[model samples]
Target: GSFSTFEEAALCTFLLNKEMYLKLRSDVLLPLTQYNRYLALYNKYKYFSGAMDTTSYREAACCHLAKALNDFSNSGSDVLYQPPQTSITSAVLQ
Candidate 1:
């Protein structure tokens, strides 16, 4: 289920980065399923606002995305008990 790696450290870093992205989205982003989709679309622009290279984009994007998600989530949470709005349709949608 996994690859044997020569550069395990690099591979580990990649996975950690992706995990961090998910955590940021889940914990802080607009947990409102509909709104989160919007944030996801703008991620690239927000991250690459200052740079033209992939490295810079990756570095800036990841942090910005996380913070953006946090901000959106915080802003939206005050109006609801949890994400997704309603439980009956939520469970059905899931």
Candidate 2:
């Protein structure tokens, strides 16, 4: 019941496939560019998404996206859904 990283969070939500989680799942897998589209939609519908009328979802999204881009630039990838590959080999015993 604990998630230490984005991949854990993403996979958990994706597997659940609940209503809102289903909407968010694809964004969880997308790169920043693609994910921004959803961000824009969310920004436009901030009142419906629970933001206060005075709050600017677009500004908040920009701030968060700045941090995300910074992290991605430093880390070179998101890896939230597609984890790094590891080698596996078949074994047979007599």
Candidate 3:
């Protein structure tokens, strides 16, 4: 709140840029790469389903991508090796 010069403001934005870049490591950068794989699956779908065909497989593929996105979202919501969860001790209920 005390920017008395233009270079000082530029340095602040520079820092902000790096802050976002840091978040990209944990943000959707990794999860979003799954889209490329999805594109391949889509290519197969159109290649086969268009060249060959699949009303049933079409439904299955649609559901598969739906679940796939869900898995990506849920995957990011929690860390696996980062820390442990209390849900691991749900025993003695046999």
Candidate 4:
């Protein structure tokens, strides 16, 4: 299961709840920003989410703040914001 932190947690929950949204479920695995924060390694784990998705989903679905910015940017009715980078894991193998 993927974990999200702060605004990202809320944002990820919303995206995950979307009817059109898709997730790897059991097969897919990625670190959550919240977990990272708990370890005091937020930035390190944040990048791990990138490994969850090889493309756009990397920034959209995994990263908390990145998706928030995407939502805001796509809305085209709010202030402009920058997307933050995150850490990633190479595979879900355990």
| Per-residue lDDT of candidate 4, residues 33-54 (tens digit) | 4423333433443544334345
Instruction: Tell me the TM-score of each prediction against the true structure.
Output: 0.29, 0.28, 0.27, 0.19
Query: How do the residues 1-94 of candidate 1 rate in per-residue lDDT, one tens digit apiece?
Result: 1223211221122222333334434423334563344456455545243322334433444444434445544554221111111234433544
Q: Write the residue-wise lDDT of candidate 3 on 1-94 in tens digits.
A: 2333322231232222233323423323434455444434544443222211235343334333423334445544322211111122322221
Candidate 2: tens digits of C-alpha lDDT, residues 1-94: 3344333342232222233233333434545665555455544543332232223433444333333433454665533332111123211210
Model 2 clash pairs are none
Q: In each prediction, how many residue pairs overlap at the backbone (N, C-alpha, C within less than 3 A)? A: 2, 0, 0, 10
Ranking by TM-score: 1, 2, 3, 4
CA deviation > 4 Å runs, candidate 4 = 1-11, 15-39, 50-94
Worst 10 residues of 1 by lDDT: 77-86
Stretches of candidate 1 off by over 4 Å are 1-50, 77-94
Q: Which is the winner by TM-score between candidate 2 and candidate 4?
A: 2
lDDT assessment of candidate 1: 0.36
lDDT of 2 at 87: 20
The superposed Cα distance between candidate 3 and the true structure at residue 35, in angstroms, equals 16
CA lDDT of each prediction against the hidden true structure:
0.36, 0.36, 0.32, 0.36
